[PDB]
Amino acid sequence: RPPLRPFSVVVASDEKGGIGDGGTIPWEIPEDMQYFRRVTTNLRGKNVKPSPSKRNAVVMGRKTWDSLPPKFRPLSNRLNVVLSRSATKEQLLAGIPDPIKRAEAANDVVAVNGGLEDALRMLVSKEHTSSIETVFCIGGGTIYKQALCAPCVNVLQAIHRTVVRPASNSCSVFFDIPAAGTKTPEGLELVRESITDERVSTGAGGKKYQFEKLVPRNS
Numbered sequence: 030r031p032p033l034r035p036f037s038v039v040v041a042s043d044e045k046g047g048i049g050d051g052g053t054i055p056w057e058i059p060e061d062m063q064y065f066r067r068v069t070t071n072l073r074g075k076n077v078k079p080s081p082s083k084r085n086a087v088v089m090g091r092k093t094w095d096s097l098p099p100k101f102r103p104l105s106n107r108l109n110v111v112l113s114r115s116a117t118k119e120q121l122l123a124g125i126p127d128p129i130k131r132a133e134a135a136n137d138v139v140a141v142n143g144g145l146e147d148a149l150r151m152l153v154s155k156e157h158t159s160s161i162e163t164v165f166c167i168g169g170g171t172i173y174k175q176a177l178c179a180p181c182v183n184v185l186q187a188i189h190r191t192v193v194r195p196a197s198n199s200c201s202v203f204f205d206i207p208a209a210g211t212k213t214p215e216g217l218e219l220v221r222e223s224i225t226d227e228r229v230s231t232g233a234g235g236k237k238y239q240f241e242k243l244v245p246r247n248s
């Protein structure tokens with residue numbers, strides 16, 4: 030009251046909950062990159078192609094948007110919602126180097142002067158409940174923290190986590206989630222719905238990874 034649009038988290042973290050060094054993701058796992066793209070891009074049902082009339086949204090902090098290599102700004106086929114206390118939509122667009130692509134990106138980027146909560150209230154609007162199918166929170170550290178506590182955590186439907194091993198020695202930013210069998214002080218307990226068997230990445234270092242899905246426990 031007002032309600033918050035339900036959402037899912039997509040993240041890649043190691044055993045220490047490390048997700049980044051403050052500016053970028055330390056490891057290179059191309060299989061996770063591809064999976065992230067498909068998971069956040071894919072729409073429900075058969076043969077539904079993303080468009081302004083219906084697509085998914087990815088919500089991220091301004092630093093995560095900046096971490097995006099300019100050539101991938103904005104994330105294609107998805108509404109990009111950037112949280113920033115100052116950066117305007119125009120200022121976000123100005124960071125897109127290809128001027129033609131920038132002209133096209135005008136309808137794919139939205140700047141929110143607020144946190145995840147503000148984004149979730151906005152994504153409930155008559156204009157987004159129909160045009161936005163699924164809302165994915167994609168980072169970073171500060172946004173994940175907001176995602177895991179009230180009032181956001183209350184509408185959290187799932188966490189698509191890519192488990193990375195071995196632990197990185199460059200992570201200073203984390204994704205703090207209660208271990209299996211534990212419930213956070215606020216009351217959040219996560220249950221593993223599924224997890225792939227460990228696989229070795231073709232990227233540098235050959236990091237081992239698993240695609241795991243977690244959902245809040247609903248006794």
Ligand SMILES: NC(=O)C1=CN([C@@H]2O[C@H](COP(=O)(O)OP(=O)(O)OC[C@H]3O[C@@H](n4cnc5c(N)ncnc54)[C@H](OP(=O)(O)O)[C@@H]3O)[C@@H](O)[C@H]2O)C=CC1
Nearest residue numbers: 041048049051052053054090091114143144168169170171
């Ligand atoms: N492994 C993974 O899956 C992921 C890793 N990352 C990594 O994490 C790091 C970035 O994390 P982090 O430092 O926490 O930065 P964030 O991505 O979380 O962005 C923080 C910023 O977002 C905006 N913001 C956050 N809360 C609010 C609010 N309540 N109101 C208005 N604006 C808000 C502000 O930007 P502003 O300064 O403009 O005001 C703030 O500085 C990088 O190392 C990146 O590579 C990021 C996503 C996923």
Ligand SMILES: CCc1nc(N)nc(N)c1-c1ccc(Cl)cc1
Nearest residue numbers: 039040041062065093097167191
């Ligand atoms: C492909 C990396 C990746 N993998 C997973 N599992 N989750 C994420 N949230 C991201 C990610 C991090 C930063 C940006 Cl800028 C875009 C996406």
